[PDB]
Design a binder for this molecule. Structure first.
Ligand code: CLA
Ligand code: CLA
Ligand code: CLA
Ligand code: CLA
Ligand code: CLA
Ligand code: CLA
Ligand code: CLA
Ligand SMILES: CCCCCCCCCCCCCCCC(=O)OC[C@H](COP(=O)(O)OC[C@@H](O)CO)OC(=O)CCCCCCCCCCCCCCC
Ligand SMILES: CC1=C(/C=C/C(C)=C/C=C/C(C)=C\C=C/C=C(C)\C=C\C=C(C)\C=C\C2=C(C)C[C@H](O)CC2(C)C)C(C)(C)C[C@@H](O)C1
Ligand SMILES: CCCCCCCCCCCCO[C@@H]1O[C@H](CO)[C@@H](O[C@H]2O[C@H](CO)[C@@H](O)[C@H](O)[C@H]2O)[C@H](O)[C@H]1O
Ligand SMILES: CC1=C(C/C=C(\C)CCC[C@H](C)CCC[C@H](C)CCCC(C)C)C(=O)c2ccccc2C1=O
Ligand code: SF4
Ligand code: SF4
Ligand SMILES: [Cl-]
Lengths: 69, 143, 141, 73, 40, 750, 80
């Protein structure tokens, strides 16, 4: 029940953004475990040692989110 | 009562009164040593000739700790409050990180010059609810 | 597999190659065809000249073979994608390793089995208090 | 920095009041806070305690390690 | 031009200008009124 | 920018007209030189990586023609920096010193060229050096240089500072010009034959030529009067000597003949100022300037002649390519083939040679200045002697490790295996294990047979067994070779050097020269305590060479990592696998070699400082006897570790800790401060960033609790940066401790 | 030998296999992601544990995990 541009809070525990709130980028069709692709304002840890930043996007599931807006 | 019996004022202390006549000069003023002899002669001293400060909370020595404590806390709250407010102000402008690396001087100065009322602003943000956050809305790690 | 045909590369010998344990315990060989005669760096040290056509070289361990393979296709315009890595036993037993099913493990391919595949998230691993005193780990179950 | 500049008269020497006062609460009179066992009129001294005369003599003799006199260091 | 006005307002230039200014303040204050172990 | 005409005359000059325009918009954009950093900071690490790659021009751009034009202007900027610094010294000597007050009575006053502002008690740092002047006693030996150069008035030093600032402006301007107006092409650079011709004939030849001319017209005729007993105000000016060439013709008998004999091959007549006396000056304790002018003239002729060996445009001359392609034997196959192309393309290949040679030559400078003091009254100033020696030791020690760094950089970035097929480099890459394991064995041997001797001596003297020690009074370890060459240099003026009147240095053997009440230089008797410490030095240098060599011979690959060349020069590891792949890159090898260079020089400088105070330096009696400071216990106490712990450290450190309340209190402060920074480095060197990032997580939660977290997400230092901060603070604290200790100790010996 | 697992959060981008230097990892057709593939680890006997796969993972936290275990001649990376 999501669309492009919704504010959702991550509830994936092990996620780097667990507790943070990101923006939905695009949702893929059915047949995928994690179709909800979310962008974030803050990069994660990803990257080799000494990297400049990280990744600010990831796929999640609907039972792992919570709309805010 | 006879609080600090082992401490005698610098005006009565033996070693302090011996050393006060032979005080060095910090600045260019040659009287600065005798200036110290006259200035520190009011504090409590020990049997070695060096002044001691009592910070247990008594008002007799409120000039020892209370005044610097208050003056610091004022200036430090000023610093932290203008920093926090400017950090929040950046969060709505273009590129929240570039303006943290390159300072918006016309904005940073405008926020610095409005910091002498940081206690009132902080209480107004706590009553309205802007000072603190909610635990259920902060990114936390797995327990 | 049946035979390891190939010409030894032009190289003046180095001390970084295989040793006594590498001949008695196990060694690795790689076979490839070169479009022409060129110079390539040795994973053990120095620069060698690969022969035109089918080549053969024996190395100590597998990572050296794969490091040479990743060099062959990336540095030269006539890229070598037919390099085949074999493990040699002390009894002459030679078996195929890389590439596995004739196709590089990069791209997908039909006819492979799911090995080490789990149907959960990492944050869904069981608690170590439930499996203690058993010879199993939170990831092995 | 203050001692190296020939000015030992500017050292921030904080008096350990909160601990010397506790010492006074057990009978140490070198500081003279007149609190509890340091005060002869506290009801803690008129209890007929058999251990009081020994403790009061042991604490204030300047020969033992029982509650040593402390300072800014 | 603004290209140099942005460089003069960078993090290191400004964080050293403030430190120099505060050093001047403290040094002049402890020149005219030194040796303030406490408040009289 | 501007537009000059052309400035060429049938030359290999090749430039590009205004390649890089002049603008300030790139100044407000930090990290623009890197593509990975231009998109904006997302973590705090982005900041660190900004400085870690500020000068690395290879990662920035791949065009070598751009990198060379960057490097040229970078050198110009460095020269501007240097000229600014030097004008600083000349101006502080002109208006903030007592050079005039020292030149009058140089044996009863101390050099000082700094005045501390009296504030918050720091005015106590102005020590009475003598003559009414109050300031910091300097140890860089600037007054001795300015006396040996002919400086006599403050206006001279003032004009020197003005000229230095003018040259700084000129170098700064030339840097901008050779990158924003007319930046040279590659045709102007890759003439290594031409560049060597010009750098030998013009730079090092004409330089010493002109300086010898200066000395003959400035330094010699004024230092001759200074050494006689004439007041500086009564001594004439240097230009009064050329305005009146008769005053120069009279002051030297050879000058009383004219200039024609030199052109008519009558050199022997100029023996009245181009002398070969040798030894030292009994008035000042330094080298004879009449010998230095002759020496600079000889070096000038030699270098100008050397600048005419390589081929340029007129056909004659050599090509280094030919010489390298010619040298090949049955042991190395093709020999030096391809080396010209290596050193004409890779800047790191060139820097790995230049840094090595420059550091070695700085060490040679220290070792030659300490024993043959070339400046007046510097051998009496033990502080200045020690300071120059140790400073030129440390500079060279750093510049040497720079070579082992840039060699690995060349290996990872510029080594083309197709260009090195069976030559020196390629064949050396083959038997890497041979050389490395042999050096491993040599280092183990030198560790057992140099340090184990000290351990054995400590255990024997501790057990109460004197007849079982390696001392001058037991199992003697006398150095025969060094004593033999000492005796050779002593008998030089009467055998293998008939024209030489005195020995090169009095350290080998001979007379004992002393100025005022202190000694300048005397024979340095070498015994067991010298043999053992020399072998200690050899061992430490061997281990440092082993480390910095395995850093280059394995930057490409190894049996552990066969694809290491892909990982680059600077990288922390390749995972905890293979048992543990931590610190395998050449960067990590330089990180390790820094510590061993420090540990080697730590024993070198202590050997110097104790041997000089024990068997050389000391007050001289009017009857003739010489009593050393530590009473000559080096030959009898420096043989055990407890001797160095007690009679060297504990004994001579007393000046630093007891310095409070005096003008040397700053040295005790910096002693404790270096002790602080040393231990501060251990926090980085012993830990790992995985703990610090987890802690930053909690502090970030705390900041977000009050909503005060920076958009620049805070990230702990990278593994490489952690190690770099660790080694940097280690070296800083150690060198600050030793600097404070050495200066406070040397200033307190009179 | 080391243990290599692949979780359902994998998007099948072959990056961990493109980074593996010992041909330990492969790619099998799956039905979870757009690419319809998931990482596989058939030849764990050649896994040294250099973590080059985990470094090259895009998902929020790893989708492939390496757990070091009983080290052997092949896992220790012994070439002598
Ligand atoms: C606006 C800036 C700002 C503000 C409001 C705060 C506020 C706070 N910090 Mg903090 N911090 C800052 C910057 C700031 N920090 C920076 C730049 C660093 C890196 C050095 C840190 C590193 C840091 C650590 C390690 C910790 C805190 C902690 C804390 C909390 C306890 C206060 C404290 O520890 O005493 C004082 C805080 C410090 C001594 C840290 C340095 C403070 C810097 C130097 C002042 C920043 C000035 C800033 C540039 C002003 C900008 C003005 C603007 C107009 C341009 C508190 C809410 C503690 C915590 O977790 O909470 C319990 C703690 O452990 N901070
Ligand atoms: C971080 C703890 C700390 C504290 C609480 C103080 C406090 C004080 N220092 Mg101090 N100082 C410190 C650290 C500290 N210092 C360190 C680490 C150094 C070494 C760099 C110094 C070096 C130093 C010097 C050289 C001097 C002081 C002086 C002073 C006094 C002057 C107050 C003043 O200027 O009036 C109020 C200021 C504005 C209203 C004051 C009581 C001055 C003094 O004379 O002491 C009495 C002085 O000369 N300090
Ligand atoms: C006012 C004169 C001026 C101006 C407007 C510019 C402008 C520019 N220069 Mg440039 N340059 C100048 C003078 C100038 N330069 C001089 C005098 C030199 C000789 C040293 C150079 C050598 C030079 C090189 C080699 C390069 C540039 C580059 C650039 C461009 C990017 C600069 C940058 O990264 O941000 C600004 C950088 C700084 C503000 C650095 C801060 C100063 C450092 C930290 C130390 C200062 C050393 C200084 C040169 C000497 C000290 C002076 C002495 C008194 C001690 C930019 C448009 C780069 C380019 O073209 O992009 C690819 C490039 O590679 N310049
Ligand atoms: C006789 C002519 C002559 C002279 C006097 C010099 C002098 C100098 N050259 Mg130079 N050079 C020359 C000809 C000459 N060059 C020619 C013909 C070429 C082309 C082949 C070069 C190419 C060249 C390069 C590439 C570099 C120099 C550099 C230098 C300086 C390095 C020495 C130094 O820094 O010490 C102290 C300096 C003053 C006391 C120095 C002042 C270096 C430099 O500083 O960059 C500007 C540098 O990198 N030169
Ligand atoms: C003229 C000599 C010379 C030159 C031209 C270079 C040039 C270069 N070196 Mg290099 N190097 C040299 C000598 C030289 N080096 C020596 C002697 C050593 C041995 C110590 C090294 C060791 C070394 C290493 C390990 C590395 C380089 C790297 C580099 C490249 C990037 C520089 C950089 O990181 O940006 C700017 C440099 C910095 C930001 C360093 C700042 C930190 C300094 C050291 C702090 C020092 C403190 C100060 C001096 C004293 C303390 C006072 C304090 C209280 C303020 C660059 C092309 C890097 C590279 O990747 O190569 C391609 C690399 O990692 N060098
Ligand atoms: C008191 C501490 C201490 C001691 C006793 C040693 C002892 C030794 N180190 Mg060592 N080292 C130390 C501290 C120490 N190190 C520290 C703190 C570092 C970090 C910089 C290093 C880094 C280091 C490296 C990188 C190397 C050594 C090596 C060696 C061995 C050289 C063989 C030898 O000396 O011959 C006889 C044995 C004893 C006298 C030797 C056993 C080298 C080696 O392995 O030998 C070839 C080697 O490469 N060390
Ligand atoms: C003399 C060595 C030294 C020093 C100074 C420190 C200092 C510190 N350690 Mg530490 N540590 C050390 C050795 C040292 N460690 C070693 C050898 C180990 C074993 C590897 C550890 C392991 C360790 C752990 C595991 C932890 C610490 C932590 C800390 C911090 C605790 C905060 C504090 O003390 O309050 C105040 C800070 C100080 C008193 C030090 C600051 C001193 C400077 C001079 C203040 C002024 C700043 C200066 C002017 C900057 C400008 C520089 C400019 C000149 C370029 C602190 C900064 C804990 C931490 O991170 O705190 C949360 C932590 O968990 N340490
Ligand atoms: C302190 C010394 C007093 C103790 C005596 C020690 C004797 C030293 C052994 C003799 C010198 C050996 C090198 C010449 C021998 C020599 O260089 O011959 C020349 C030979 C190659 O020459 P080519 O015939 O190829 O000549 C063509 C060249 O132009 C390049 O193509 O080099 C080698 O032998 C490679 C093997 C090096 C490995 C041997 C070196 C041993 C390392 C230790 C050296 C100690 C030197 C100490 C000096 C301070
Ligand atoms: C009586 C007194 C002392 C005794 C003091 C007592 C014992 C200390 C008590 C401390 C108590 C336990 C803590 C006090 C307050 C704790 C709350 C949580 C404070 C929160 C402050 C935060 C919310 C402020 C945040 C933002 C404030 C508003 C302004 C800053 O710019 C910036 C920034 C930090 C973001 C002794 C030591 C005995 C000596 C005696 O002479 C005087
Ligand atoms: C002698 C000491 C000198 C240093 C001390 C004086 C500092 C003076 C600060 C300059 C004041 C102007 O203030 C500075 O204006 C520039 C204009 O480019 C702003 O710059 C910002 O906005 C401009 C447009 O307005 C953008 O094009 C630019 O990319 C961005 O960085 C800075 O965010 C602000 O800090
Ligand atoms: C403490 C620590 C950190 C954390 C270190 C940090 C966060 C550095 C702190 C830097 C602060 C924010 C800046 C203060 C220092 C400045 C560089 C000094 C400049 C002062 C001028 C502005 C005057 C690591 O990241 C680390 C990594 C690997 C091994 C060990 C360690 C380690 O021990
Ligand atoms: S990188 Fe990770 S998530 Fe992507 S295909 Fe490989 S194992 Fe799966
Ligand atoms: S841990 Fe390293 S060696 Fe093992 S599968 Fe992953 S990338 Fe390959
Ligand atoms: Cl001893």
């Amino acid at each position: 029940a999501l669309n492009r541009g919704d504010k959702v809070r991550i509830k994936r525990t092990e996620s780097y953004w667990y507790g943070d709130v990101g923006t939905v980028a695009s949702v893929e069709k059915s047949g995928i475990l994690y179709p909800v692709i979310v962008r974030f304002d803050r990069v994660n840890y990803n990257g080799f040692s000494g990297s400049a930043s990280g990744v600010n996007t990831n796929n999640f599931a609907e039972n792992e989110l919570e709309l805010v807006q | 009562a006879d609080d600090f019996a082992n401490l005698t004022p610098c005006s009565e202390n033996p070693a302090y009164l011996a050393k006060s006549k032979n005080f060095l000069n910090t600045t260019n003023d040659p009287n600065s040593g005798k200036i110290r002899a006259e200035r520190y002669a009011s504090a409590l001293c020990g049997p070695e000739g060096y002044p001691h400060l009592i910070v247990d909370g008594r008002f007799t020595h409120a000039g020892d700790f209370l005044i610097p404590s208050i003056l610091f806390l004022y200036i430090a709250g000023w610093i932290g409050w203008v920093g926090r407010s400017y950090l929040i102000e950046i969060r709505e402008s273009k590129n929240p990180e570039m303006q943290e690396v390159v300072i918006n001087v016309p904005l940073a100065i405008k926020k610095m010059l409005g910091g002498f009322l940081w206690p009132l602003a902080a209480v107004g943000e706590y009553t309205s609810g802007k000072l603190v956050m909610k635990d259920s809305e902060i990114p936390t790690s797995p327990r | 597999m049946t035979e390891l045909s190939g010409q030894p590369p032009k190289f003046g010998g180095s001390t970084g190659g295989l040793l006594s344990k590498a001949n008695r315990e196990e060694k690795y060989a790689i076979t490839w065809t070169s479009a022409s005669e060129q110079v390539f760096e040795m994973p053990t040290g120095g620069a060698a000249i690969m022969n035109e056509g089918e080549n053969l070289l024996y190395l100590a361990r597998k990572e050296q073979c794969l490091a040479l393979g990743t060099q062959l296709r990336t540095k030269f315009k006539p890229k070598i994608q037919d390099y085949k890595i074999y493990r040699v036993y002390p009894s002459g037993e030679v078996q195929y390793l890389h590439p596995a099913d004739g196709v590089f493990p990069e791209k997908v391919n039909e006819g492979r089995e799911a090995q080490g595949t789990k149907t959960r998230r990492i944050g869904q691993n069981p608690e170590p208090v439930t499996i203690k005193f058993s010879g199993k780990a939170p990831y092995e179950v | 920095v203050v001692v190296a500049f020939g000015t030992p008269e500017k050292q921030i020497l904080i008096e350990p009041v909160f601990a010397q006062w506790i010492q006074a609460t057990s009978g140490k009179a070198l500081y003279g806070f007149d609190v509890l066992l340091s005060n002869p009129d506290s009801i803690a001294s008129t209890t007929g305690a058999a251990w009081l005369p020994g403790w009061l003599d042991a604490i204030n003799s300047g020969t033992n390690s029982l509650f040593l006199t402390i300072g800014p260091g | 031009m603004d290209g140099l006005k942005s460089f003069l307002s960078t993090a290191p230039v400004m964080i050293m200008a403030l430190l120099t200014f505060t050093a001047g303040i403290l040094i002049e204050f402890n020149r005219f009124y030194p040796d303030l172990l406490f408040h009289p | 920018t501007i537009s000059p005409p052309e400035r060429e005359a049938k030359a290999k000059v090749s430039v590009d007209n205004n390649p890089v325009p002049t603008s300030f918009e790139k100044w407000g954009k930090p990290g623009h030189f890197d593509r990975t950093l231009a998109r904006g900071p997302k973590t705090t690490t982005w900041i660190w990586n900004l400085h870690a790659n500020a000068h690395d021009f290879d990662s920035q751009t791949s065009d070598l023609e751009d990198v060379s034009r960057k490097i040229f202007s970078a050198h110009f900027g460095h020269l501007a920096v240097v000229f600014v610094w030097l004008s600083g010294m000349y101006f502080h000597g002109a208006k903030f010193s007592n050079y005039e007050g020292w030149l009058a009575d140089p044996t009863h006053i101390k050099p000082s060229a700094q005045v501390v502002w009296p504030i918050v008690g720091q005015g106590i740092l102005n020590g009475d050096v003598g003559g009414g002047f109050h300031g910091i006693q300097i140890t860089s030996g600037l007054f001795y240089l300015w006396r040996a150069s002919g400086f006599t008035d403050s206006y001279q030093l003032y004009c020197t500072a003005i000229g230095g600032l003018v040259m700084a402006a000129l170098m700064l301007f030339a840097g901008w010009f050779h990158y924003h107006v007319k930046a040279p092409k590659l045709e102007w650079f890759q003439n290594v034959e031409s560049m060597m011709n010009h750098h030998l004939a013009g730079l090092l030849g004409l330089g010493s030529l002109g300086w010898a001319g200066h000395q003959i017209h400035v330094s010699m005729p004024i230092n001759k009067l200074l050494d006689a007993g004439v007041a500086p105000k009564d001594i004439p000016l240097p230009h009064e000597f050329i305005l009146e060439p008769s005053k120069m013709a009279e002051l030297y008998p050879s000058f009383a003949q004219g200039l024609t004999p030199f052109f008519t091959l009558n050199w022997g007549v100029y023996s009245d100022f181009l002398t070969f006396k040798g030894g030292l000056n009994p008035v000042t304790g330094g080298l004879w300037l009449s010998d230095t002018a002759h020496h600079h003239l000889a070096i000038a002729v030699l270098f100008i002649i050397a600048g005419h060996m390589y081929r340029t445009n007129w056909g004659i001359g050599h090509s280094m390519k030919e010489i390298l392609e010619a040298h090949k034997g049955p042991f190395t196959g093709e020999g030096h083939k391809g080396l010209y192309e290596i050193l004409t393309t890779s800047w790191h290949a060139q820097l790995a040679i230049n840094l090595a040679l420059l550091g070695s030559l700085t060490i040679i400078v220290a070792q030659h200045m300490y024993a043959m003091p070339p400046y007046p009254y510097q051998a009496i100033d033990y502080a200045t002697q020690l300071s120059l020696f140790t400073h030129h030791m440390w500079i060279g020690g750093f510049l040497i490790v720079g070579a082992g760094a840039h060699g690995a950089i060349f290996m990872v970035r510029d080594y083309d295996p197709a260009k090195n097929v069976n030559n020196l480099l390629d064949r050396m890459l083959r038997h890497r294990d041979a050389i490395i394991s042999h050096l491993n064995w040599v280092c183990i041997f030198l560790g057992f047979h140099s340090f184990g001797l000290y351990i054995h001596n400590d255990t024997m003297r501790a057990l109460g067994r004197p007849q079982d020690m390696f001392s001058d009074t037991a199992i003697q370890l006398q150095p025969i070779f060094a004593q033999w060459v000492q005796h050779l240099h002593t008998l030089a003026p009467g055998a293998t050097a008939p024209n030489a009147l005195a020995t090169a240095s009095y350290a080998f053997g001979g007379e004992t020269i002393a100025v005022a009440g202190k000694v300048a230089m005397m024979p340095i008797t070498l015994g067991t305590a010298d043999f053992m410490v020399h072998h200690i030095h050899a061992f430490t240098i061997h281990v440092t060479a082993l480390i910095l060599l395995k850093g280059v011979l394995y930057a490409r690959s190894s049996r552990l990592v066969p694809d290491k060349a892909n990982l680059g020069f600077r990288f922390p590891c390749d995972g905890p696998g293979r048992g543990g792949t931590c610190q395998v890159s050449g960067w990590d090898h330089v990180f390790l070699g820094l510590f061993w260079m420090y540990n080697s020089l730590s024993i070198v400088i202590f050997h110097f400082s104790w041997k000089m105070q024990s068997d050389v330096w000391g007050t001289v009696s009017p009857d003739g006897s010489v009593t050393h400071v530590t009473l000559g216990n080096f030959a009898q106490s420096a043989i055990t570790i407890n001797g160095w712990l007690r009679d060297f450290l504990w004994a001579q450190a007393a000046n630093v800790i007891n310095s409070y309340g005096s003008a040397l209190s700053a040295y005790g402060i910096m002693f404790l401060a270096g002790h602080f920074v040393f231990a501060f480095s251990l926090m980085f060197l012993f830990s790992g960033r995985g703990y610090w990032q987890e802690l930053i997580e909690s502090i970030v939660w705390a900041h977000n609790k009050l909503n005060v977290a920076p958009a620049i997400q805070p990230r702990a230092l990278s593994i490489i940066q952690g190690r770099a901060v660790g080694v940097a603070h280690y070296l800083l604290g150690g060198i600050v401790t030793t600097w404070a200790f050495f200066l406070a100790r040397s200033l307190s010996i009179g | 030998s080391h243990s290599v697992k692949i979780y359902d959060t994998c998007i099948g981008c072959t990056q961990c296999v493109r980074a593996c230097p010992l041909d330990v990892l492969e790619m099998v057709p799956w039905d979870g992601c757009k690419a319809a593939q998931i990482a596989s680890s058939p030849r764990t006997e050649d896994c040294v544990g250099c973590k080059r796969c985990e470094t090259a993972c895009p998902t929020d936290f790893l989708s492939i995990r390496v757990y070091l275990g009983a080290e052997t001649t092949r896992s220790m990376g012994l070439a002598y």
